């Protein structure tokens, strides 16, 4: 989101949001630009939710520089879209027993847990098999919540939980003491599918709140 920034400069702007996903967009974009090295490039100054771009006005016209940054940002968003798997989660109620305590331990409503949880773009950083679990990075800290004092013996397949600053899900029924906030209806790990998990490390995940009814 792309605005002029004074003398021979533009600011890409994401914007206003201190955020690890934001931080990495900035960085990835600066990188995407550095991959081209356009001949008109003077400086790139990342900030937490923006990137300053400065150009040599003898090399590139203003209108050129503006257009190009619009085009390189389009292609960054398309690259990240291609890497993004959308995951429906029915949050609260029977599907997540522990959501009320997550809210309350953090001083929020349940609806707020749901927005804060499903807002980021998560990175899949590790997968385990047998029992399958997907471990994710990128959770907002306002929903951080320690584990149950004693684990449940049977967590249904698809449970989305929190455990400190981590979120992830139980791919099949298994023990665990993570705070369960929602359940996924997709069979996320399926031996005898190729590949056998729907996300692989290095993929991104977008959780998508659904109701009970387009859960079943």
PDB file of C-alpha atoms in Angstrom:
ATOM      1  CA  UNK A   1       0.000   0.000   0.000  1.00  0.00           C
ATOM      2  CA  UNK A   2       2.067   2.496  -1.727  1.00  0.00           C
ATOM      3  CA  UNK A   3       2.423   6.309  -1.101  1.00  0.00           C
ATOM      4  CA  UNK A   4       4.894   9.039  -1.870  1.00  0.00           C
ATOM      5  CA  UNK A   5       7.282   9.765   0.890  1.00  0.00           C
ATOM      6  CA  UNK A   6       8.979  13.033  -0.015  1.00  0.00           C
ATOM      7  CA  UNK A   7      12.057  13.552  -1.960  1.00  0.00           C
ATOM      8  CA  UNK A   8      12.539  10.853  -4.535  1.00  0.00           C
ATOM      9  CA  UNK A   9      11.004   8.221  -2.213  1.00  0.00           C
ATOM     10  CA  UNK A  10       8.076   5.888  -1.650  1.00  0.00           C
ATOM     11  CA  UNK A  11       6.815   4.143   1.426  1.00  0.00           C
ATOM     12  CA  UNK A  12       5.312   0.784   1.339  1.00  0.00           C
ATOM     13  CA  UNK A  13       3.210   0.702   4.300  1.00  0.00           C
ATOM     14  CA  UNK A  14       1.225  -2.652   5.692  1.00  0.00           C
ATOM     15  CA  UNK A  15       0.396  -0.777   8.043  1.00  0.00           C
ATOM     16  CA  UNK A  16       0.257   0.203  11.789  1.00  0.00           C
ATOM     17  CA  UNK A  17       0.297  -3.308  13.350  1.00  0.00           C
ATOM     18  CA  UNK A  18       3.327  -4.546  15.262  1.00  0.00           C
ATOM     19  CA  UNK A  19       3.364  -8.167  14.079  1.00  0.00           C
ATOM     20  CA  UNK A  20       5.751 -10.971  13.102  1.00  0.00           C
ATOM     21  CA  UNK A  21       3.844 -11.526   9.922  1.00  0.00           C
ATOM     22  CA  UNK A  22       4.110  -7.815   9.042  1.00  0.00           C
ATOM     23  CA  UNK A  23       7.762  -7.857   9.919  1.00  0.00           C
ATOM     24  CA  UNK A  24       8.283 -10.716   7.445  1.00  0.00           C
ATOM     25  CA  UNK A  25       6.217  -9.146   4.644  1.00  0.00           C
ATOM     26  CA  UNK A  26       8.480  -6.036   4.943  1.00  0.00           C
ATOM     27  CA  UNK A  27      11.568  -8.173   4.915  1.00  0.00           C
ATOM     28  CA  UNK A  28      10.314 -10.484   2.060  1.00  0.00           C
ATOM     29  CA  UNK A  29       9.371  -7.486  -0.016  1.00  0.00           C
ATOM     30  CA  UNK A  30      12.749  -5.907   0.478  1.00  0.00           C
ATOM     31  CA  UNK A  31      14.239  -9.127  -0.519  1.00  0.00           C
ATOM     32  CA  UNK A  32      11.940  -9.330  -3.629  1.00  0.00           C
ATOM     33  CA  UNK A  33      13.160  -5.944  -4.640  1.00  0.00           C
ATOM     34  CA  UNK A  34      16.805  -6.844  -4.003  1.00  0.00           C
ATOM     35  CA  UNK A  35      16.294  -9.902  -6.240  1.00  0.00           C
ATOM     36  CA  UNK A  36      15.674  -7.548  -9.169  1.00  0.00           C
ATOM     37  CA  UNK A  37      18.214  -4.889  -8.315  1.00  0.00           C
ATOM     38  CA  UNK A  38      16.594  -2.259 -10.392  1.00  0.00           C
ATOM     39  CA  UNK A  39      19.102   0.206 -11.819  1.00  0.00           C
ATOM     40  CA  UNK A  40      17.245   3.118 -10.285  1.00  0.00           C
ATOM     41  CA  UNK A  41      17.537   1.783  -6.639  1.00  0.00           C
ATOM     42  CA  UNK A  42      19.199   3.899  -4.075  1.00  0.00           C
ATOM     43  CA  UNK A  43      18.211   2.686  -0.581  1.00  0.00           C
ATOM     44  CA  UNK A  44      15.683   0.400   1.167  1.00  0.00           C
ATOM     45  CA  UNK A  45      14.904   1.085   4.859  1.00  0.00           C
ATOM     46  CA  UNK A  46      12.608  -1.521   6.366  1.00  0.00           C
ATOM     47  CA  UNK A  47      10.590  -0.457   9.474  1.00  0.00           C
ATOM     48  CA  UNK A  48       8.226  -2.659  11.499  1.00  0.00           C
ATOM     49  CA  UNK A  49       5.158  -2.091   9.291  1.00  0.00           C
ATOM     50  CA  UNK A  50       6.655  -0.267   6.276  1.00  0.00           C
ATOM     51  CA  UNK A  51       9.434  -0.099   3.715  1.00  0.00           C
ATOM     52  CA  UNK A  52      11.036   3.033   2.538  1.00  0.00           C
ATOM     53  CA  UNK A  53      12.192   3.053  -0.994  1.00  0.00           C
ATOM     54  CA  UNK A  54      14.430   5.637  -2.489  1.00  0.00           C
ATOM     55  CA  UNK A  55      15.275   6.101  -6.095  1.00  0.00           C
ATOM     56  CA  UNK A  56      17.589   8.035  -8.316  1.00  0.00           C
ATOM     57  CA  UNK A  57      15.311  10.566 -10.096  1.00  0.00           C
ATOM     58  CA  UNK A  58      17.650  10.733 -13.126  1.00  0.00           C
ATOM     59  CA  UNK A  59      17.325   6.993 -13.710  1.00  0.00           C
ATOM     60  CA  UNK A  60      13.741   6.329 -13.230  1.00  0.00           C
ATOM     61  CA  UNK A  61      10.847   8.531 -13.451  1.00  0.00           C
ATOM     62  CA  UNK A  62       8.542   9.059 -10.560  1.00  0.00           C
ATOM     63  CA  UNK A  63       5.706   7.298 -12.243  1.00  0.00           C
ATOM     64  CA  UNK A  64       7.816   4.387 -13.276  1.00  0.00           C
ATOM     65  CA  UNK A  65       8.953   3.868  -9.681  1.00  0.00           C
ATOM     66  CA  UNK A  66       5.529   4.042  -8.326  1.00  0.00           C
ATOM     67  CA  UNK A  67       4.199   1.507 -10.911  1.00  0.00           C
ATOM     68  CA  UNK A  68       7.003  -0.916 -10.374  1.00  0.00           C
ATOM     69  CA  UNK A  69       6.501  -1.047  -6.574  1.00  0.00           C
ATOM     70  CA  UNK A  70       2.841  -1.626  -7.117  1.00  0.00           C
ATOM     71  CA  UNK A  71       3.817  -4.613  -9.362  1.00  0.00           C
ATOM     72  CA  UNK A  72       6.441  -6.163  -7.179  1.00  0.00           C
ATOM     73  CA  UNK A  73       3.933  -5.972  -4.193  1.00  0.00           C
ATOM     74  CA  UNK A  74       1.211  -7.719  -6.239  1.00  0.00           C
ATOM     75  CA  UNK A  75       3.584 -10.543  -6.991  1.00  0.00           C
ATOM     76  CA  UNK A  76       4.668 -10.858  -3.323  1.00  0.00           C
ATOM     77  CA  UNK A  77       0.990 -11.161  -2.278  1.00  0.00           C
ATOM     78  CA  UNK A  78       0.406 -13.702  -5.047  1.00  0.00           C
ATOM     79  CA  UNK A  79       3.441 -15.725  -4.007  1.00  0.00           C
ATOM     80  CA  UNK A  80       2.238 -15.831  -0.375  1.00  0.00           C
ATOM     81  CA  UNK A  81      -1.318 -16.679  -1.533  1.00  0.00           C
ATOM     82  CA  UNK A  82       0.074 -19.665  -3.423  1.00  0.00           C
ATOM     83  CA  UNK A  83       1.668 -20.954  -0.203  1.00  0.00           C
ATOM     84  CA  UNK A  84      -1.381 -20.423   1.956  1.00  0.00           C
ATOM     85  CA  UNK A  85      -3.710 -23.214   2.967  1.00  0.00           C
ATOM     86  CA  UNK A  86      -7.084 -22.131   4.382  1.00  0.00           C
ATOM     87  CA  UNK A  87      -8.273 -24.244   7.328  1.00  0.00           C
ATOM     88  CA  UNK A  88     -11.888 -24.165   8.578  1.00  0.00           C
ATOM     89  CA  UNK A  89     -12.154 -24.347  12.394  1.00  0.00           C
ATOM     90  CA  UNK A  90     -15.482 -24.452  14.263  1.00  0.00           C
ATOM     91  CA  UNK A  91     -14.465 -22.406  17.382  1.00  0.00           C
ATOM     92  CA  UNK A  92     -16.018 -22.582  20.888  1.00  0.00           C
ATOM     93  CA  UNK A  93     -18.822 -24.713  22.404  1.00  0.00           C
ATOM     94  CA  UNK A  94     -18.248 -28.403  22.297  1.00  0.00           C
ATOM     95  CA  UNK A  95     -15.444 -28.157  19.758  1.00  0.00           C
ATOM     96  CA  UNK A  96     -13.311 -26.070  21.999  1.00  0.00           C
ATOM     97  CA  UNK A  97     -14.041 -26.593  25.763  1.00  0.00           C
ATOM     98  CA  UNK A  98     -11.197 -24.472  26.881  1.00  0.00           C
ATOM     99  CA  UNK A  99     -11.917 -21.253  24.997  1.00  0.00           C
ATOM    100  CA  UNK A 100     -13.614 -19.571  27.875  1.00  0.00           C
ATOM    101  CA  UNK A 101     -10.604 -20.057  30.142  1.00  0.00           C
ATOM    102  CA  UNK A 102      -8.290 -18.768  27.331  1.00  0.00           C
ATOM    103  CA  UNK A 103     -10.411 -15.608  27.086  1.00  0.00           C
ATOM    104  CA  UNK A 104     -10.660 -15.175  30.784  1.00  0.00           C
ATOM    105  CA  UNK A 105      -6.930 -15.877  31.522  1.00  0.00           C
ATOM    106  CA  UNK A 106      -6.177 -13.061  29.027  1.00  0.00           C
ATOM    107  CA  UNK A 107      -8.989 -10.664  29.816  1.00  0.00           C
ATOM    108  CA  UNK A 108     -10.915 -10.925  26.591  1.00  0.00           C
ATOM    109  CA  UNK A 109     -14.204 -12.130  25.271  1.00  0.00           C
ATOM    110  CA  UNK A 110     -14.523 -15.389  23.511  1.00  0.00           C
ATOM    111  CA  UNK A 111     -15.306 -13.588  20.181  1.00  0.00           C
ATOM    112  CA  UNK A 112     -11.937 -11.717  20.681  1.00  0.00           C
ATOM    113  CA  UNK A 113     -10.014 -15.011  21.139  1.00  0.00           C
ATOM    114  CA  UNK A 114     -11.609 -16.141  17.846  1.00  0.00           C
ATOM    115  CA  UNK A 115     -10.529 -12.948  15.886  1.00  0.00           C
ATOM    116  CA  UNK A 116      -7.067 -12.856  17.438  1.00  0.00           C
ATOM    117  CA  UNK A 117      -6.555 -16.519  16.793  1.00  0.00           C
ATOM    118  CA  UNK A 118      -7.839 -16.553  13.217  1.00  0.00           C
ATOM    119  CA  UNK A 119      -6.305 -13.160  12.146  1.00  0.00           C
ATOM    120  CA  UNK A 120      -2.605 -14.113  11.566  1.00  0.00           C
ATOM    121  CA  UNK A 121      -0.974 -15.882   8.735  1.00  0.00           C
ATOM    122  CA  UNK A 122       0.706 -18.786  10.452  1.00  0.00           C
ATOM    123  CA  UNK A 123       3.871 -20.615   9.439  1.00  0.00           C
ATOM    124  CA  UNK A 124       3.950 -24.433   9.653  1.00  0.00           C
ATOM    125  CA  UNK A 125       7.336 -25.081  11.154  1.00  0.00           C
ATOM    126  CA  UNK A 126       7.260 -28.806  12.071  1.00  0.00           C
ATOM    127  CA  UNK A 127       5.040 -31.812  11.543  1.00  0.00           C
ATOM    128  CA  UNK A 128       4.797 -35.011  13.601  1.00  0.00           C
ATOM    129  CA  UNK A 129       3.351 -38.189  12.627  1.00  0.00           C
ATOM    130  CA  UNK A 130       1.823 -40.838  14.598  1.00  0.00           C
ATOM    131  CA  UNK A 131       0.062 -39.290  16.145  1.00  0.00           C
ATOM    132  CA  UNK A 132       0.047 -36.446  13.747  1.00  0.00           C
ATOM    133  CA  UNK A 133       0.424 -32.908  15.192  1.00  0.00           C
ATOM    134  CA  UNK A 134       1.055 -29.611  13.284  1.00  0.00           C
ATOM    135  CA  UNK A 135       3.081 -27.037  15.089  1.00  0.00           C
ATOM    136  CA  UNK A 136       2.665 -23.430  14.047  1.00  0.00           C
ATOM    137  CA  UNK A 137       4.464 -20.172  14.578  1.00  0.00           C
ATOM    138  CA  UNK A 138       3.088 -16.704  14.420  1.00  0.00           C
ATOM    139  CA  UNK A 139       0.377 -16.663  17.176  1.00  0.00           C
ATOM    140  CA  UNK A 140      -0.556 -13.274  18.695  1.00  0.00           C
ATOM    141  CA  UNK A 141       0.715 -13.235  22.385  1.00  0.00           C
ATOM    142  CA  UNK A 142      -2.551 -11.771  23.754  1.00  0.00           C
ATOM    143  CA  UNK A 143      -3.996 -15.284  23.595  1.00  0.00           C
ATOM    144  CA  UNK A 144      -0.951 -17.018  25.186  1.00  0.00           C
ATOM    145  CA  UNK A 145      -2.194 -19.684  27.735  1.00  0.00           C
ATOM    146  CA  UNK A 146      -0.391 -22.398  29.714  1.00  0.00           C
ATOM    147  CA  UNK A 147      -1.393 -26.114  29.268  1.00  0.00           C
ATOM    148  CA  UNK A 148      -3.851 -28.090  31.430  1.00  0.00           C
ATOM    149  CA  UNK A 149      -2.344 -29.185  34.703  1.00  0.00           C
ATOM    150  CA  UNK A 150      -3.139 -32.721  33.668  1.00  0.00           C
ATOM    151  CA  UNK A 151      -3.576 -33.833  30.032  1.00  0.00           C
ATOM    152  CA  UNK A 152      -6.826 -35.142  28.566  1.00  0.00           C
ATOM    153  CA  UNK A 153      -6.604 -38.782  27.489  1.00  0.00           C
ATOM    154  CA  UNK A 154      -8.479 -38.434  24.198  1.00  0.00           C
ATOM    155  CA  UNK A 155      -8.542 -35.181  22.232  1.00  0.00           C
ATOM    156  CA  UNK A 156     -10.645 -35.527  19.141  1.00  0.00           C
ATOM    157  CA  UNK A 157      -8.852 -35.448  15.781  1.00  0.00           C
ATOM    158  CA  UNK A 158      -8.781 -31.838  14.462  1.00  0.00           C
ATOM    159  CA  UNK A 159      -8.532 -30.069  17.836  1.00  0.00           C
ATOM    160  CA  UNK A 160      -6.872 -26.679  17.651  1.00  0.00           C
ATOM    161  CA  UNK A 161      -5.106 -25.769  20.821  1.00  0.00           C
ATOM    162  CA  UNK A 162      -2.822 -23.241  22.508  1.00  0.00           C
ATOM    163  CA  UNK A 163       0.093 -24.006  24.721  1.00  0.00           C
ATOM    164  CA  UNK A 164       2.040 -20.914  25.741  1.00  0.00           C
ATOM    165  CA  UNK A 165       2.770 -18.833  22.714  1.00  0.00           C
ATOM    166  CA  UNK A 166       2.090 -21.803  20.311  1.00  0.00           C
ATOM    167  CA  UNK A 167      -0.870 -22.970  18.509  1.00  0.00           C
ATOM    168  CA  UNK A 168      -1.295 -26.051  16.394  1.00  0.00           C
ATOM    169  CA  UNK A 169      -3.662 -28.948  16.103  1.00  0.00           C
ATOM    170  CA  UNK A 170      -4.079 -32.648  16.948  1.00  0.00           C
ATOM    171  CA  UNK A 171      -4.340 -34.327  13.545  1.00  0.00           C
ATOM    172  CA  UNK A 172      -5.889 -37.480  15.062  1.00  0.00           C
ATOM    173  CA  UNK A 173      -7.404 -38.519  18.420  1.00  0.00           C
ATOM    174  CA  UNK A 174      -4.586 -38.604  20.962  1.00  0.00           C
ATOM    175  CA  UNK A 175      -3.656 -37.446  24.497  1.00  0.00           C
ATOM    176  CA  UNK A 176      -2.694 -33.805  25.182  1.00  0.00           C
ATOM    177  CA  UNK A 177      -2.917 -31.040  27.649  1.00  0.00           C
ATOM    178  CA  UNK A 178      -3.163 -28.033  25.186  1.00  0.00           C
ATOM    179  CA  UNK A 179      -6.081 -25.562  25.636  1.00  0.00           C
ATOM    180  CA  UNK A 180      -8.554 -26.657  23.021  1.00  0.00           C
ATOM    181  CA  UNK A 181     -10.439 -23.717  21.325  1.00  0.00           C
ATOM    182  CA  UNK A 182     -11.886 -25.187  18.141  1.00  0.00           C
ATOM    183  CA  UNK A 183     -11.909 -28.195  15.889  1.00  0.00           C
ATOM    184  CA  UNK A 184     -11.107 -28.700  12.231  1.00  0.00           C
ATOM    185  CA  UNK A 185     -13.498 -30.968  10.168  1.00  0.00           C
ATOM    186  CA  UNK A 186     -11.003 -31.784   7.364  1.00  0.00           C
ATOM    187  CA  UNK A 187      -8.921 -34.946   7.688  1.00  0.00           C
ATOM    188  CA  UNK A 188      -5.644 -33.005   7.817  1.00  0.00           C
ATOM    189  CA  UNK A 189      -3.373 -36.084   7.939  1.00  0.00           C
ATOM    190  CA  UNK A 190      -4.360 -39.104   5.907  1.00  0.00           C
ATOM    191  CA  UNK A 191      -1.901 -41.895   5.290  1.00  0.00           C
ATOM    192  CA  UNK A 192      -2.873 -43.157   1.815  1.00  0.00           C
ATOM    193  CA  UNK A 193      -3.258 -39.578   0.486  1.00  0.00           C
ATOM    194  CA  UNK A 194      -0.246 -38.173  -1.372  1.00  0.00           C
ATOM    195  CA  UNK A 195       0.971 -36.105   0.350  1.00  0.00           C
ATOM    196  CA  UNK A 196      -0.288 -37.424   3.662  1.00  0.00           C
ATOM    197  CA  UNK A 197      -0.728 -34.021   5.456  1.00  0.00           C
ATOM    198  CA  UNK A 198      -2.535 -31.062   3.764  1.00  0.00           C
ATOM    199  CA  UNK A 199       0.293 -28.453   4.855  1.00  0.00           C
ATOM    200  CA  UNK A 200       3.917 -29.112   4.845  1.00  0.00           C
ATOM    201  CA  UNK A 201       6.669 -27.237   6.712  1.00  0.00           C
ATOM    202  CA  UNK A 202       7.181 -23.777   5.090  1.00  0.00           C
ATOM    203  CA  UNK A 203       3.545 -23.494   4.095  1.00  0.00           C
ATOM    204  CA  UNK A 204       1.243 -20.823   5.673  1.00  0.00           C
ATOM    205  CA  UNK A 205      -2.095 -21.392   7.269  1.00  0.00           C
ATOM    206  CA  UNK A 206      -5.148 -19.235   7.484  1.00  0.00           C
ATOM    207  CA  UNK A 207      -7.784 -20.405  10.009  1.00  0.00           C
ATOM    208  CA  UNK A 208     -11.325 -19.736   8.876  1.00  0.00           C
ATOM    209  CA  UNK A 209     -14.070 -19.684  11.558  1.00  0.00           C
ATOM    210  CA  UNK A 210     -17.084 -21.820  10.425  1.00  0.00           C
ATOM    211  CA  UNK A 211     -20.331 -22.816  12.356  1.00  0.00           C
ATOM    212  CA  UNK A 212     -21.311 -26.371  13.548  1.00  0.00           C
ATOM    213  CA  UNK A 213     -23.172 -26.766  10.411  1.00  0.00           C
ATOM    214  CA  UNK A 214     -20.535 -26.236   8.036  1.00  0.00           C
ATOM    215  CA  UNK A 215     -18.490 -28.409  10.243  1.00  0.00           C
ATOM    216  CA  UNK A 216     -20.596 -31.553   9.616  1.00  0.00           C
TER     217      UNK A 216
END
